[PDB]
Amino acid sequence: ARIAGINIPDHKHAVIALTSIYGVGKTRSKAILAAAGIAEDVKISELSEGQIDTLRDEVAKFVVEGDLRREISMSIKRLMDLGCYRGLRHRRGLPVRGQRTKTNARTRKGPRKP
Amino acid sequence: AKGIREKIKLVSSAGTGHFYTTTKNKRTKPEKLELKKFDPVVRQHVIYKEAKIK
Amino acid sequence: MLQPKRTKFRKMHKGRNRGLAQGTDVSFGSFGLKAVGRGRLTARQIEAARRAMTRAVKRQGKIWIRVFPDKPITEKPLAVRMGKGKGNVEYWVALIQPGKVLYEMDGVPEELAREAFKLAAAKLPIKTTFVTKTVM
Amino acid sequence: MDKKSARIRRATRARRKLQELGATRLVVHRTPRHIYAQVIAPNGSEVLVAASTVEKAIAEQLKYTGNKDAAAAVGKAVAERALEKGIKDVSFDRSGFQYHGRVQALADAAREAGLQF
Amino acid sequence: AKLHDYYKDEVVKKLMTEFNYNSVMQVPRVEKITLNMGVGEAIADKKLLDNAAADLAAISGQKPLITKARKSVAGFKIRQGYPIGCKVTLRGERMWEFFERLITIAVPRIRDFRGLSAKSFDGRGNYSMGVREQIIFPEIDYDKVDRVRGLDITITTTAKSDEEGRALLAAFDFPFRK
RNA sequence: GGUCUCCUCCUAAAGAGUAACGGAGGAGCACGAAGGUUGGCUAAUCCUGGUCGGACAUCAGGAGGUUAGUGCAAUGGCAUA
RNA sequence: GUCGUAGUCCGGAUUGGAGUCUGCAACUCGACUCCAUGAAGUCGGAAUCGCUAGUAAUCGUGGAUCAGAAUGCCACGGUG
RNA sequence: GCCCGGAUAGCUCAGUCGGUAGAGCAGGGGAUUGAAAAUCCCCGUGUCCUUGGUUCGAUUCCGAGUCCGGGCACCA
Secondary structure, three states, rough: OOOOOOOOOOEEEHHHOOOOOOOOOOHHHHHHHOOOOOOOOEEHHHOOOOOOOOHHHOOOOOOOOHHHHHHHHHHHHHHOOOOOHHHHHHHHOOOOOOOOOOOOEEEEEEEEOO | OOOOOOOEEEEEOOOOOOOOOOOEEEOOOOOOOOOOOOOOOOOOOOOOOOOOOO | OOOOOOOOOOOOOOOOOOOOOOOOOOOOOOOOOOOOOEEOOOHHHHHHHOOOOOOOOOOOOOOOOOOOOOOOOOOOOOOOOOOOOOOOOOOOOOEOOOOOOOOOOOOOOHHHHHHHHHOOOOOOOOOOOOOOOOOO | OOOOOOOOHHHOOOHHOOOOOOOOOOOOOOOOOHHHHHHOOOOOOOOOOOOOOOOOOOOOOOOOOOOOHHHHHHHHHHHHHHHOOOOOOOOOOOOOOOOHHHHHHHHHHHHHOOOOO | OOOOOHOOOOOHHHHHOOOOOOOOOOOOOEEEEEOOOOOOOOOOOOOOOOHHHHHHHHHHHHOOOOOOOOOOOOOOOOOOOOOOOOOOEEEEOOOHHHHHHHOOOOOOOOOOOOOOOOOEEEOOEEEEEEOOOOOOOOOOOOOOOOOOOOOOOOEEEEEOOOOOOOOOOOOOOOOOOO
């Protein structure tokens, strides 16, 4: 019913509603249906046990939901615990990719502190 | 011109004195209300609510 | 330069009668074709003047003739005269006696341009001030 | 001010010279430090005048401290009393820019015993 | 107050030596800023986005202007009359405020932060900031954002020229990249 | 067939005015304000910058000079607007 | 024991990150694992198929082919 | 030559106080048929005839043009 557990994407196209899972995307949720036969134009309901559940099979290949995030939060810390610039910036909510933290970075830093 | 929709004539009038004073107005544009001053037979101005009073 | 009696782009009026006076020019290139003798080019002439200014030798040399029309005419078919005047379709440039043709290229041009003069509307000498101290 | 422009209503009345003609003005000035004034015939006789702060008057530098309705007023007083002649002749004081506070204290400072309007 | 003092006290004299003039007046001053959001709803500017100024208001602490429009008929379905703006400028003491509340608080708000755009000087001195969204300047319950059409802001200064500038801003600005 | 009133410009010979079934257009209104006055303010357009732009949207400075705007034709006029 | 009718604790398509095992070799074009992503779909018009008892219904188990690509095919039993 | 009208989907046509336009047919994809039709389901890629103007913006409003259509060209 939830495939990868929790969240029941119902009354929407397959792939489109498949991405609902906190791990797949427009492409991934798509690449799976191919080797699953299940089309996109079919609403999860329209499916059957040998249709909706089958999806839950080739999904255990990728990582998703809770632990996926945790495994990342930790992995991040792995390189972040190190006194590297990235971490030093990651533990301050500052852009670690390459933006101008000097200004314009709301969504980055956070709310305004006038 | 004399379309019952656009500009019409405003007979206008004063408060006690039996004056006249005329002008033009409309219909669709906010109406059913009017009053200025204007000078009567003699003396002061005041009133002249004309037709269509507030 | 060209004529195609290219219309002055489009309309903006189309009337006025006529009236000529005196010429107003010198030179720009090298060889010239002075006007002299008042008249008016049929415009269609300038096309004939140019179409003939290159037969033997290639389009080589910079031919620049410099006179610009602007002068609707109009005529009437086989009708009375409601004094309106139908379309123009003629275009007769006003030419008093200026003089304009340029053959940027060293050569004999005289016998070359005169080859096209007969196409013109009237007589017109040549004269060519290769240069300039005539006028500051 | 005048820097950015002159093409402003500030000149509209200054052209009181026409019609009013004889109508004389006061001008009056701002300049943070002083105020000035002076009164001349319209334009037909700039060969007339009054007085600004005129340092010498009671002491040497016109011993006065302030600029509010206090100093501003006297700023006019001199032109006023000194030009006793012109009063009934109906002058005018020309705002120049704005008619408030400083110039007000200057203008009204005259309205008292002077410039009959 | 906050920062305006860093100026005379530890900012003027750097410029008085570097570039090197002689008047503490010719010392590059900071005129104002002026924020203003932009894109308005051609048709929908009404209830939608009137709360758009509600933000820029308190974000600065003044009264927005909301501005109007100077564009006629051609392709954009608006006829030179709608609000569709905000503006809001600060030159007063409250100008240094929003400054001591930029460099310090959230110049670095996005994950894509790295500093300030080097090459964005107006050609004679001032600099036009931009950035796209979020609040960056919290002072809201924050459970109501409607991605209120960003922020522009353009600090105006008496900077003589392009490069004459930079060194000015480059003197408190703890955020500007490298 | 078209036109028969009125308004603008050219013809209309630098005071008026003057014709043609001469060359171009407008009116048969609008406006408790689009009037009065007082106080105040000045275009269009482009250049460089600016998130939501990729021609033009509000912002910043600069070049910013009837090339704007005049309730509706054209002429004349308009910054003291 | 829980979660309490929401697109969810449903359903899993997709995609990204990185990995295993077969086999010279798996870009093209493989099976699987982990992490993250988590769509359509809230039972499906017109019309249409199978099924009369251990049947239909559903739940698993094995095998042929085969180095390694099964929701297909063949086959077994549980509940009914 | 003159006046009046038309020009919109492949055909024949309907339509708009000025902002994103349709019908019958043909066309196309499903269906049902042994197969065609007939029938059932789902489908418009229109620079709204051209060229100037008004306008922020024109298929629409203004002028002109081509083309078609109706009428007319008479006494002599």
